[model samples]
Target chain A: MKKVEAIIRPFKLDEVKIALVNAGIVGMTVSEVRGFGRQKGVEFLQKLKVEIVVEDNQVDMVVDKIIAAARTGEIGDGKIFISPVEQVIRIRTGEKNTEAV
Target chain B: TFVEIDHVDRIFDLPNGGRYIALKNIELKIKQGEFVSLIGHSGCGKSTLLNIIAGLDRASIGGVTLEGREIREPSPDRMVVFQNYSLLPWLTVRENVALAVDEVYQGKSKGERRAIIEEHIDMVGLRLAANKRPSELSGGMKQRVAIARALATRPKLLLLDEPFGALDALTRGSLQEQLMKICNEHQITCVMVTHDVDEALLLSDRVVMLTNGPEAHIGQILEVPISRPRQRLEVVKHPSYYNLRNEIIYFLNQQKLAKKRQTQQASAPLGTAKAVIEIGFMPLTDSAPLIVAKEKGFFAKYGLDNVILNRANNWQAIATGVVTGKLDAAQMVAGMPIALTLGAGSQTPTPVINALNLSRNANAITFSKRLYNQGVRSLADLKAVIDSSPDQILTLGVVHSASMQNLILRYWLAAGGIDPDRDVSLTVIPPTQMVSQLKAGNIDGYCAGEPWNYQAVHDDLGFVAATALEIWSGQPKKVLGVREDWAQKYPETYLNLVKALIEACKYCDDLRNREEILEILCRPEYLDVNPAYVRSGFIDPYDRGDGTPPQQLTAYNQFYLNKTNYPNRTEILWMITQMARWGLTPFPKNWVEITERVCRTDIFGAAARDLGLLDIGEDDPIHLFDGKLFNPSEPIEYLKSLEIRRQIRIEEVFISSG
Candidate 1:
């Protein structure tokens, strides 16, 4: 088992979560976020600063899906960040490493 | 190829939600020796664009090449001017600038470096004052040193973040004059972020106005089409100056949107829909629309559901309330939105946005009866009187620096070729105090929005010299402005607010509507004066402050005409140009964008269309005594035309500490 951190479009969380489950990646955690890319700033009347973070081993696959969903070429294209976590632990099981995650 | 790029995009991470934005794509062309000013209110990524050029900030996906050399890190060749003067205080100005040129040239002769420093310092007009440190220098002087320092380095590219913002008007204007000279003399390419309209016009060859940021984008770029080696007075005398100035002023006006005033406070949960809508208003005939909106229940009828009126004594109070988040929104003098956005009285700059054009033509220029006794009647006669009393400080009272009273009074004064700030001491007084100040001889004359001018004449104190109608008649008189943040959050409420006022405007114009309207406007709680004076403009026959009896005038107090509800750009642009002419706010290069955003016909039109009233006329040309035809379609060419105005300055209006 491996611990992976990822950033994806806000709208793609459900798709990535479901995909990981089907791929036998048991569980993952996510935090809501806001961000801007190529987009000058928040384009809408409502200006929102956005950022998101996620943890999963299928990081590469999740990233591919996230980019596909957040493409509005004019500006405001989303991004993803993937890095291997140093370690993982399961609080309920008192397990460490891949088995705990 | 010294530089190459493939799929480059930059992402910025922030708390709550982050953002990914792009500066400029690989596909663009910039000629050598071109002076480009990257201007916008805030967050236009202009800095990001310049950063990539200077190699200070990087593009996640692209690279820049200069003279076939790719940039990877911030280099001495590509210099940037921070809004804060990043001067080496211990070092003399000559040394500060020399430090850069020394590194960039890589061991040029001692004579060469000395000449470079001297030339640039002289270019920025600091030759005599170059040794002073930042702590000892005025903001204008310090910025001059920074510019001199940047130019002396002879960087291939230069960047400035509102370099002149910290300076006062006199100094800011002088620096702008110096900046254009350097840009022309050396041909050093530069990019700057500024809210100052006039400064942008005089300095940058290309002025770009950016939209609101978070994910801000470029709104538009205006080409400063005027020829170089410019003179401030000559540029103003040029036929196009007013138009160019107006264009930039309008763009800034867009950024200056005021927050919608909501009457209810704290009843609505944080981050939730508003429970009450508060609107601000002054006591004038134009405020009749606002008053009628509430008294006639138009606000309730429109489903604004809850609303209340917050009475402000003058435009300053109205402007400040929206700026400080006290009043949700207010009915303000036409100049209020432009002035408030530019940070006139309060040192801290807070930008407000104007969405609705509520009313027009309610201002009048009045002179003290004593002046009339001096045989001065019209502007021409006043000019003669002024010539006679050349030693006097012809004091005039304007509500505030940002008020239409100030701008209009100045414009009219300049038409006679009178320098308002110098020749006369135009002081600020509340409208209620205008007449008192006039009678006390503290102010020789005044330009005010109603009942005071009427009240003065009735009291045999001051007499109307020229109604705003007689001089530049039909200019935008009053508007409804709100904070930009508030407008964006409650788009629905914003529309309802405009809609309620639109109906109220129609109700106000009806002749039969007068009796009730006059009584409501004259209430002791509001104007606190007898209904007699306000009725002079409304119900009763017109009463000239002179011995002549007043007659019925339909156009005197107009809330709806030529689509009065629609935010007109040209008129607001005119107001902005005048503000810059007298140095309230600097003119910008990308004035088109600034005006477009602030004058929101989308909300205004929504209200107008729902009611089916249309202004089918084409945009009006801006006409001023300076004799320049302001075509909204062309801004840069217009700025080049002005001749007798203050040196226009450029800067981002800044605010810190609320």
Candidate 2:
């Protein structure tokens, strides 16, 4: 299992989804949230969607695409998280790690 | 038509020739396109008056007219929808509606009539069920179609005889909103007869309540102040909801009294105690009887000293000061002396005894505004949400876990199937600090002593979920606690404290003292809150966070009124059961020893004897959330009978912290 969290601008969701599909990784949860980083405030007066999960190492490829697709070259563009995943089990089919992600 | 309610008198000649006079001299007027409701009991002529206007029945004295013309016979120009389905049963709902439209628009082309039919069916939300016959439709659906049929015909005036009356509560509620929306959209002049307050409130522009019939006449006219395109939830949650509801209920209660008075009224308002002690209580609305005894001035006139008035906050705080031998004695929670006796919680177990029960059924479980935002609406929802969100610390703030607030909150939470101790965190925050900590996002919510819960609501920052008055109605709230040492030392002073608070409790419950207590409770030193919020709990019906009709709740926030202060042993045993159920404190093995030690009824009896007040009602065995019943008389076994509880640990005096 792997840890993944992507904080991307709300509008870039489509491109990010396309990137994830192109990277051959599917399955994630999305939630609307308000947060702040060291910059201390959101840039471009936009919202962000944080997708948090413990998924398979396949997230490496997805993270790579998220960086390429979601980057705006300005502050608050995006941040991706990768941590050691303790456990990941899909609720619907009891699938593990890669399948769950 | 400007409400052409003319000489509306109806006299029904009985078979015995003793006529039943439904209504007499009912001359009323409302503006055009205005909604008016004829409200009364079955015997009230209000319904008969509506029939006269609909031309369904003749008025013995005067006739009714729409826009100045006399109405002798019912017509399509003036549609009538009855409680019994008036739709043609053989025809489908669509066809039934079409029949009325076709008759009204005789000159129209078939396409236009069919379009009218389709539009009316769609208007009543019956498009999917249009082809279904009356037999296939619900009572509400049938009524909706009937309403659509009437409105589709474009009548000058529409008459409804309890249009949604046959529907169940939920159905009736929805249909009323629908009827209101339709009437407003079409600007149709409507007259409806309804016993349902919500319906009258939603649909009518004016609700004319008629007194008990036989000669029923209009009592009070409630103006429906809400506007159209109204949200269903918005209507019931409106600020004026409870006030409007109480207005109607009070009128009815008065009518009930009127009927009772026709034979007998509460003959003597509880015989005045022979030796009235002039006990003093601060004028806080919580000081109900003091307010009652003061204003109604039952004290001074009754030869009672009706002494000094002192205001206090957190009855336990006041009672603690009393036990420590500072103040004489004051109102204390039902569990205070027991908690003190056992040296439980933070205990400086001083000898405290209850002379008289001052009031019962006032404490309640109030959730913080923060918890509400978490979508925790009910006890079940709170449990599910708390269980689901185990990552975050869901904290509940209370003054002391040993207090009634903690015990009741624990019971309520567990009732929803969550283990209170293991599942969630309980934090002890003084009642004074509850709101600030809540605002700071320290504790998720809290259940505390009054005016604090009302404080949050009055500040418009929170709403009350359940009051002790709601969870277990009429349980002893605050008792007069004096230190056992203090009691033995100044026995007379202890009796005086009990006498004073009881007097205050009486005044607090008075309808007249509402303003006085409202002011006192709102004062910063007391249960500081808005007078409006405090005043409502005193006498007004309540509104939980969710939208529900305001019931004329009696045991809502009792101060005095019903010998409320009396301590029932069974009630305390139940509290002990709850304590044991949640493992707050252990049930004593030698229960008779503990209850006897915890509750000093002998001391209470002595105080009563000294004051010369009547000791009529004693220990009444009570039942519980589980079907278990306990008799206070068989006190010892009752302790052993409980299934869940902490082992009761008793010592002389100890104060420790977690």
Candidate 3:
């Protein structure tokens, strides 16, 4: 399993989420986050962070969908990070690892 | 298109060998039978655009055309109704109409001309008063005659320049309804200039908002979506009404800030600090001290000679103006400084200084006559009514979230065992529009500053359920607020400004000066309201607008008495506590430091001593009508002791640099 996290413009959150959902991915967490990046001479810009855990094979597909949906051809389009997931557990059903994914 | 304003630009040559661009690159098209309104702040060139269209003034660049015919001068095809009702005093209403009909319809027979005059006079419902001269007619009647005369010409277009601006609120409302009906029936393509938001919305098919002048142009054009043949009450109930109103208001506020920035940039060469100061104030009774300071020459006396009083349309504008450096200072609600400092409502934490308390305790909570008719008279009665109707949640109006009206109303409701947030909904409304909103059944009750409460009562639309005197007597209502950086940079100018307001506050509290002050306040540039509405709470006995007789409430409006002008930290602390108790802002953990920084008693004392007045306020325990005690030393504990409150948030607030 892999954990995929993407930070994008706040206004593009809905578009990214819909793209990811239509690609058969679900159960993602979204939060409002603010930070400055490679964009120069700018104060903190409000962005949305989305995190999802899926099968390792789906990592490239999810990241591509997020970038495709969130890009504005601008400096603040933001980035994504991918890492291997240790474990996952659905608390209500005690489903573990790939079952939870 | 019926009329086309094609890329018009108006420039005036100044005597100083320079030119002023009044309107620039303005373009619009109006259809036949379409009602268009021009609206913006003063000096935004709305009137100039209207004049250009009327052919009274020429555009320097592009021109205005009607049905493809370029308009060069005033013609019988276009007729105007001015705010002053430009009628010859010697002529009667019938004669006034006759003059226009006779001129335009010279090609017609004599009987036809006379019939046109009589028909228009009767159309405006003025046949009975057709023989009365302009001097004998009331303001509303005279305006109606002007409308009749304009229509008597049977012009292709009608131009109205604030035709109902001089009339009282109710009179203006009825005249607007009549004009709307007349235009619809006659298929008149009308263009009007108005400052009233509701008026523009109710009448105009399209509203054109202009930006501030010196290269003024169209800011935005909003198309009214409410389907007509409209009635005033039903129009307000439309879903599009408030959204449209907010859009226009937001645009106007942005323009004000832009205008200020432009002025500042233009005057930047005069060193880091400028002598000319702009103070923002809403046109309420409590704003009298600010007005008196400017009008009575106290500002001049104190060496602040070029003070400009900017009349803000609402409290939010005042806050935004002060925060954006559009205004040097402003008359603020007591909680405004603290709320701004603590960054309430997710706004950036902008530290504000309150050096002088402007006024205290002249607000009342009023409920609609419908509620009164339903046997609800007291706080307990209100709770009972709320209990009886579990399905209906009544909405109440307050001027601002940081205003004492909201705090006091919430406190009063909570004390009656009715949850303010749950039992009723509170909405923010401008002070001037409170009465009309109540009459339109948009709000069931409202807690606001006087003149509004008194005006509502005078109109017999509502009765006072409670006064601030009963909620928290002598509570701080308004204060002189400025940005902390502004005070730091212009310390001497700030002191002079404070000194002038201190003297003006003294003048305002003097009973002997009340009549004169009322006259100045009732002027067209000031409140622009009827003197009787202002007189109810200023000089005359306070009438509840119920069955009770008027009574003398001497402390109804305390501008400067009993250390009213002193910026007391204890009272500010109490306001801070109330703000936190309602979750409007977090209770700053550094309350003492915040209080000390915001309430500049040193400046108040220095200004007071210069005027030979009391310099210090007594640190007495605060008492309320409900017999609750407020310990200024322990505000968080006091907040916890309250029986009803929202979940409080506490944080250490840090000021951000301006």
Best by lDDT: 3
| Interface RMSD for all numbered candidates | 22.3, 36.7, 29.3
Tens digit of lDDT per residue, candidate 2, span B247-283? 5665555555445442332232332332322222322
Best by TM-score: 1
True contacts kept of 2: 0.00
For B181-271, candidate 1 gives per-residue lDDT tens digits of 6766666666666766777776667776655533343455566777776777777787876776776666756554411111122134334
Model 3, B533: alpha-carbon shift in Å? 1.3
Which sequence of candidate numbers ranks them by lDDT, best first? 3, 1, 2
Interface DockQ of candidate 3? 0.02
TM-score of each: 0.52, 0.43, 0.51
Indicate the residue-level lDDT of B498 in model 2.
Answer: 55
User: Per-residue alpha-carbon lDDT of model 3 for B1-658, expressed as tens digits?
Assistant: 6688876767789899566657655667888888889988898687788888888987776678788656777988888887777889988888878888877777898886777887888878887897888999888788888888888887888899898898889998988888877866777888889998888988889888776646565545677887868887788899879978976776676566555654554454332658578888888888899999988899889788788888888889999999898886888888788888887787898888888888988788888899889998898888888898766689888899876778877878888898888888998999877778887887888777777787768778889877778777777788889887776566688888888888788677766677899888887778888888878867888888778999877677888665577776667787788888878788886564567668766577567545665443555466778666775545777899998988988776766544
Query: Ten-residue segment with the worst summed lDDT in candidate 2 chain B?
Result: B649-658
Give me the TM-scores for chain A across all models, comma-separated: 0.53, 0.72, 0.89
How far residue B209's Cα lies from its native spot in candidate 2, in Å, is: 58
Q: What share of the true interface contacts does candidate 3 keep?
A: 0.00
lDDT of 1 at B380: 85
Q: Which segments of model 2 are wrong by more than 4 Å?
A: A1-101, B1-320, B346-349, B369-374, B458-460, B520-530, B576-586, B602-614, B624-626, B631-658
Local accuracy of candidate 2 as per-residue lDDT tens digits, A1-101 = 66677888768788777756654455667777765532223333455665655334234344555665675423345577777765466678876454533
10 residues in a row with least lDDT, candidate 3 chain A: A35-44
| Candidate No. with top DockQ | 3
